[PDB]
């Protein structure tokens, strides 16, 4: 009657060491959504959209199969909108908001950390799912 699916979402980022000449990009980053434990979300997730900043070409990035990750390069931090669509078209999409983190703190730089990570926990809650959805969520 009520099913809970824990996830983590956010991004990792790594500094080039230098501003790139062609585009002025300074970082590589990957924004993502993952199951909290090692399992398959694709049984009940149809697609996940990652809406990037307007300065990216084709900013609405759509991922239809795992892993639900988008890798890019850039120079700036901005909010990414994440929308998770389900196999049951009548189950409302879940929307997440994530501030992309690129710039390492001086503290973590002095500690010698190589990557920036900004990751959050959430729960997709399915109340009174259709019989199909209940099957897909519990295989």
């Amino acid at each position: 009657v009520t099913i809970v699916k824990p996830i983590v979402y956010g991004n990792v980022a790594r500094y080039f060491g230098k501003k790139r000449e062609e585009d002025g990009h300074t970082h590589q980053w990957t924004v993502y959504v993952k199951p909290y434990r090692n399992e398959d979300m694709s049984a009940y997730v149809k697609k996940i959209q990652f809406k990037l900043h307007e300065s990216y070409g084709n900013p609405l990035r759509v991922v239809t199969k795992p892993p639900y990750e988008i890798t890019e390069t850039g120079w700036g931090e901005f909010e990414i909108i994440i929308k998770i669509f389900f196999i049951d078209p009548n189950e409302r999409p879940v929307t997440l908001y994530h501030l992309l983190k690129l710039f390492q703190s001086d503290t973590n730089a002095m500690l010698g950390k190589k990557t920036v990570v900004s990751e959050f926990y959430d729960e997709m809650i399915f109340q009174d799912p259709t019989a199909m959805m209940q099957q897909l969520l519990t295989t």
Binding site: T26, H53, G76, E77, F78, E79, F103
Partner: peptide, 10 residues
């Protein structure tokens, strides 16, 4: 109203 900001370092 519907569009957000992008910011560089420093």
């Amino acid at each position: 109203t519907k569009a957000a900001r992008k910011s560089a370092p420093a």
